[PDB]
Amino acid sequence: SRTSELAVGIFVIIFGIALFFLAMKVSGLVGTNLSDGYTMKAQFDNVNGLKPRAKVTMSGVTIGRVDSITLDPVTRLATVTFDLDGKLTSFNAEQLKEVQKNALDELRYSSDYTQATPAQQKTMEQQLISNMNSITSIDEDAYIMVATNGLLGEKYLKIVPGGGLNYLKRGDTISNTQGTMDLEDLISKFI
Amino acid sequence: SRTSELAVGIFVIIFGIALFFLAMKVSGLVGTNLSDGYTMKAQFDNVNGLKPRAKVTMSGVTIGRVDSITLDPVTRLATVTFDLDGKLTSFNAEQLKEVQKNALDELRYSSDYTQATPAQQKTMEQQLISNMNSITSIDEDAYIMVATNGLLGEKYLKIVPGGGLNYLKRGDTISNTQGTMDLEDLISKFI
Amino acid sequence: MNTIAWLGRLVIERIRGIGVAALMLLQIIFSLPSAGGFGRFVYQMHRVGVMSLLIITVSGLFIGLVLGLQGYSILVNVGSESMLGTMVSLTLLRELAPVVAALLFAGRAGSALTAEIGSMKQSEQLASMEMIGVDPLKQIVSPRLWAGIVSLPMLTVIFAAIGIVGGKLVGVDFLGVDEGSFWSGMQNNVQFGHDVVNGIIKSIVFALLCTWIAVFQGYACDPTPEGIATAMTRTVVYSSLCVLGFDFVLTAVMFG
Amino acid sequence: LLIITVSGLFIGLVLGLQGYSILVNVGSESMLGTMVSLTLLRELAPVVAALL
């Protein structure tokens, strides 16, 4: 029986570790509790006060977290590396129906009509090989930047959705960036 | 004997006081009650920390909450649903003539009726059927915005009124907006 | 290598000791109650609950006088003490009143149950009760366990209500802050279902551990007049470690 | 020595987790290291370590 007691005791503590590593994940405090995440990165010139686990916002809505900040010695440009949730920035199988009649509607416009070929089957062929696979909501004339969240809150990456032509692939690097504006420069201009 | 039946009955009384004191003298339960509310909605270009169950003001008075702030990823703009009230914000049983006697006053004015399509009873009968139900105090030229009180407090929504000849009916999208400003906005606009 | 051998023998007996106390809990709560079981639960609510009412109400006042006096000395430098009524009622409702009122319940009414069931074991009242046929778990132990799970969440509310009222006394009426901005700072920042209900669920998990330990130590004693008193310090130590241990786990879930 | 060192850790994990949840709304958490070491040094460590 004593063995029984023992067992029914090793099963409590093992269950007591199964709870501590459940409540540490759902707290956000360890691991990544955001679904199907895909990773993009950018190149700044100056990113002050930006640790990992920062906010990435599209219009003020938290979509992602930052993971690593490295610095290239030769070119002197910093490097951010963030992960974005994909449940609400991607066009999934339903949401293709909203973009296929919109992203290919800019392709068959009056600008592209008498420009390449008025016999071309490429203008519809470019979209569905890019609409179905590796799509984002982010346009190819958007720039990203660092903002402040209350002139007192910690820094957070901010996307500025500007215009729209085309998307990125899952894993692409945003070209256009905008650096911060630190404290000791604002007091130069203000005076 | 009867003491142990009584000195527990006192213990439930002193618990009964100190539970009622917490709910309706400390916690906000008695102050939050949507008096026969409904729901309208809007679309924003920046919601930088508009936390749910915030407050909505018309002139500096609480007439609404916040329920959901999600993206609209076909335009990448926000989407907020706020539940106002049906006694502070609409015209009640006696008050229904006060908006038909104002529709006849400034809207059905003869110098105003002789500025549009020619009729005698087209708009004159519409103001008796459209204006009777599904109508709030908000004139439709009143654009909602995000604001904050002080320089440390949370974000709250402000409806600035003015003008207006038709009223927003029910579940309608408030026309214009403006986003919230912080350090990434202001010093890039102070120049 | 005897000290390492004695140390490994110590924590193996303490592991087995958990497994006996787990099987003792499944025998109490998985049983429909015997006839007369409510008449003893009302009496055991008198011993555990009502006798503990004096220490909690007095000590709850003394923390409120400290929280109002320390929160004013910090919030006067930043000059914003319309948040005094918030941080007093936010320190108590989610953090101190679940925790401190379980550190005083383990002492006063926690260890008293281990003396009560413990002295019944050395003087053979438990062994005599069984030969009549009455099962001592259902008769003696089970009205004491259910009077512990009920009487502590009724006592953290009296701890939290007296602590805020005491903090209102030294903040508003002695140091001189505004009374209206004291109360109106509370209803903005302190919700009910996120703060007052989550301060009650935190004390039900605490009331289970300070009672299931304090009953098991007095049931599995060794019958000896100086073996009882060594199991009354085993139940104050083990309760204060499981209160502070399940504090961090419940705080990370509720406020993470 | 064993009860105090273990239970002293569990309060520190709570004070760091509660002080961050409040000081992130006002956005000033360079005072996190102050309020943790000010709650312990003058108030909690004299009191809780006498209750244990």
UniProtKB/TrEMBL annotation, chains A, B:
Residue ranges of the TM segments: 5-24
Signal peptide: none
Keyword terms: Membrane, Transmembrane, Transmembrane helix
Limits of the Mce/MlaD domain: 36-162
GO molecular function: phospholipid binding; phospholipid transporter activity
Protein name (Swiss-Prot/TrEMBL): ABC transporter periplasmic substrate-binding protein
Organism: Acinetobacter baumannii
Organism lineage string: Bacteria, Pseudomonadati, Pseudomonadota, Gammaproteobacteria, Moraxellales
Gene that specifies this protein: mlaD
Section of the entire sequence shown: 3 to 193 of 226
UniProtKB/TrEMBL annotation, chain D:
The UniProt record lists the keyword Cell inner membrane: yes
Transmembrane segments: 1-24
Keywords: Cell inner membrane, Cell membrane, Membrane, Transmembrane, Transmembrane helix, Transport
Subcellular location: Cell inner membrane
Subcellular location, principal: membrane
Gene Ontology CC terms: ATP-binding cassette (ABC) transporter complex
Highest taxon of source: Bacteria
MF terms (GO), sorted A to Z: phospholipid transporter activity
Protein task: Part of the ABC transporter complex MlaFEDB, which is involved in a phospholipid transport pathway that maintains lipid asymmetry in the outer membrane by retrograde trafficking of phospholipids from the outer membrane to the inner membrane. Probably responsible for the translocation of the substrate across the membrane.
Protein family membership: Belongs to the MlaE permease family.
Subunit record text: The complex is composed of two ATP-binding proteins (MlaF), two transmembrane proteins (MlaE), two cytoplasmic solute-binding proteins (MlaB) and six periplasmic solute-binding proteins (MlaD).
Descriptive protein name: Intermembrane phospholipid transport system permease protein MlaE
Organism: Acinetobacter baumannii
Covered residues, full protein: 53 to 104 of 258
